Design an enzyme around this catalytic site. Sequence first.
Site, PDB file in Angstrom:
ATOM      1  N   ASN A  73      -9.062  -6.205  -0.422  1.00  0.00           N
ATOM      2  CA  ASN A  73     -10.044  -6.141   0.578  1.00  0.00           C
ATOM      3  C   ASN A  73     -11.711  -6.712  -0.103  1.00  0.00           C
ATOM      4  OD1 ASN A  73      -9.407  -4.771   2.918  1.00  0.00           O
ATOM      5  ND2 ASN A  73      -9.177  -2.929   1.733  1.00  0.00           N
ATOM      6  N   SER A  95      -5.602  -5.081   8.300  1.00  0.00           N
ATOM      7  CA  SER A  95      -5.862  -6.178   7.249  1.00  0.00           C
ATOM      8  C   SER A  95      -5.029  -7.329   7.681  1.00  0.00           C
ATOM      9  CB  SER A  95      -5.073  -5.808   6.060  1.00  0.00           C
ATOM     10  OG  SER A  95      -5.775  -4.393   5.597  1.00  0.00           O
ATOM     11  N   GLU A 151     -14.533  -1.625   7.596  1.00  0.00           N
ATOM     12  CA  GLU A 151     -14.947  -0.974   8.892  1.00  0.00           C
ATOM     13  C   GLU A 151     -13.942  -1.440  10.209  1.00  0.00           C
ATOM     14  OE1 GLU A 151     -17.213  -2.458   6.495  1.00  0.00           O
ATOM     15  OE2 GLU A 151     -17.810  -0.710   5.640  1.00  0.00           O
TER      16      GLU A 151
HETATM   17  C1  LIG Z   1      -5.187  -3.405   5.801  1.00  0.00           C
HETATM   18  O1  LIG Z   1      -4.613  -3.070   6.796  1.00  0.00           O
HETATM   19  C2  LIG Z   1      -5.394  -2.378   4.642  1.00  0.00           C
HETATM   20  C3  LIG Z   1      -4.819  -2.657   3.486  1.00  0.00           C
HETATM   21  N1  LIG Z   1      -3.419  -3.651   4.004  1.00  0.00           N
HETATM   22  C4  LIG Z   1      -2.301  -3.168   3.956  1.00  0.00           C
HETATM   23  C5  LIG Z   1      -1.104  -3.718   4.447  1.00  0.00           C
HETATM   24  O2  LIG Z   1      -1.234  -4.883   4.156  1.00  0.00           O
HETATM   25  O3  LIG Z   1      -0.096  -3.053   4.827  1.00  0.00           O
HETATM   26  C6  LIG Z   1      -2.318  -1.755   3.052  1.00  0.00           C
HETATM   27  S1  LIG Z   1      -1.157  -0.695   2.988  1.00  0.00           S
HETATM   28  C7  LIG Z   1      -0.830  -0.615   1.256  1.00  0.00           C
HETATM   29  C8  LIG Z   1      -0.243  -2.101   0.908  1.00  0.00           C
HETATM   30  N2  LIG Z   1       1.192  -1.784   0.811  1.00  0.00           N
HETATM   31  C9  LIG Z   1       1.208  -0.215   0.012  1.00  0.00           C
HETATM   32  C10 LIG Z   1       2.613   0.140   0.562  1.00  0.00           C
HETATM   33  O4  LIG Z   1       3.199  -0.224   1.366  1.00  0.00           O
HETATM   34  N3  LIG Z   1       2.915   1.388  -0.176  1.00  0.00           N
HETATM   35  C11 LIG Z   1       2.016   1.954  -1.030  1.00  0.00           C
HETATM   36  C12 LIG Z   1       4.407   1.938   0.335  1.00  0.00           C
HETATM   37  C13 LIG Z   1       0.251   0.468   0.854  1.00  0.00           C
HETATM   38  C14 LIG Z   1      -3.845  -1.651   2.767  1.00  0.00           C
HETATM   39  C15 LIG Z   1      -4.585   0.052   2.857  1.00  0.00           C
HETATM   40  C16 LIG Z   1      -6.793  -2.285   4.061  1.00  0.00           C
HETATM   41  C17 LIG Z   1      -7.842  -1.807   5.352  1.00  0.00           C
HETATM   42  O5  LIG Z   1      -7.067  -1.666   3.187  1.00  0.00           O
END
Ligand SMILES: *C(=O)[C@@H]([C@@H]1NC(C(=O)O)=C(S[C@@H]2CN[C@H](C(=O)N(C)C)C2)[C@@H]1C)[C@@H](C)O
Length: 270
Positions: free
Chosen positions: A110, A48, A147
Site C-alpha cells: 500500500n 487492492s 480508504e
Molecule cells: C488490498 O486488497 C489489500 C491487500 N491486498 C491484498 C491482496 O492482494 O489480496 C491483501 S490480502 C494479503 C495478501 N495475501 C495474504 C494471504 O493471502 N494470506 C496471508 C493467506 C493476505 C492485502 C490486505 C489492502 C487494502 O491492504
Amino acid sequence: ASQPPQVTVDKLKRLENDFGGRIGVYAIDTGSNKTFGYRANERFPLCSSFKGFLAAAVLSKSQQQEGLLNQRIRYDNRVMEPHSPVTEKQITTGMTVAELSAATLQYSDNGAANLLLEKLIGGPEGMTSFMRSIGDNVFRLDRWALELNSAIPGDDRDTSTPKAVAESMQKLAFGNVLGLTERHQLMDWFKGNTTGGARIRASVPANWVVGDKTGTCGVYGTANDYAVIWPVAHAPIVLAVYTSKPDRNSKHSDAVIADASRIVLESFNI
Ligand SMILES: *C(=O)[C@@H]([C@@H]1NC(C(=O)O)=C(S[C@@H]2CN[C@H](C(=O)N(C)C)C2)[C@@H]1C)[C@@H](C)O
C-alpha cells in the site's frame, strides 16, 4: 466446441448459492475472441486490485519520460500504510519507480501504491484518467490506498465491473496502448505476483503460466483476482473474478474464486 453459456451460468449460480454471496466474471479468449460473462456488468469493489493498473499507468508515463523507471524516490519520516512489506524495509535506501511498481503489484504494498499515486500518477483522479485514456469508461478510483476498501453495498466509489477489468487487461497486455518494452515489463510483473496462489492460479494445471493481481478488502466478504492465463499451445485467456457478500462481518473465500475460475476456464474446452 465450447460449453453452452447457460451451462456455465447454471454452474456459477449453484456456486453462488453455496458461497452466500455474489460472483461476477468475464473471460476473453484472445485467439478466437469468444467471451463469457456472468454479472459481468455489475459493479464490485476493486480493493487492492487497482494496483495492476497503477503499474500500467507508470509504464505508460515512462514511455514518454526517458529513464523514469530508474528514478529513486526517498520517503524518510513518512508514515507508512499498513500492509507495506517492501517499502517499510527500504526507507534508508529509497526505491526506484520500477521497484515501487513491482512491489505494489507483486506484494500489494500500500505504501508503494500511495507513493506512486502521490508522486507520479496524480492521485485517484489521475488513476481514473489513465483508465479513461485507454477507453475504460467504467473504472473509477475515488480514494487513496487504505480508504478505498470499505466495500459498502451500493457505493460505487472505487469500483469497476468484471467486463471492464478484463477488457482493460486485454488492452494493456496485448493491444497498442503500451509499447512492446512496456507490455513485456507489465506481463513480467503480473507473472511474478506473490498473493494469488489460492485464487486463479489454484484453478489451472501447474504447467500453465499465469500473471495476476488480487484484491482483498477485508470486509463484506469482498475479494477478487484478474489474470492473463497462458494454457499449453493455446492463445492466452484474460479472466476477471470479483466477489462480495451482503454481511459486513463475513469473510471472503479464496476457494470460491478458484472454483469460479475453474468453471469459466473449463467452459472454453481448451
Ligand atoms: C488490498 O486488497 C489489500 C491487500 N491486498 C491484498 C491482496 O492482494 O489480496 C491483501 S490480502 C494479503 C495478501 N495475501 C495474504 C494471504 O493471502 N494470506 C496471508 C493467506 C493476505 C492485502 C490486505 C489492502 C487494502 O491492504
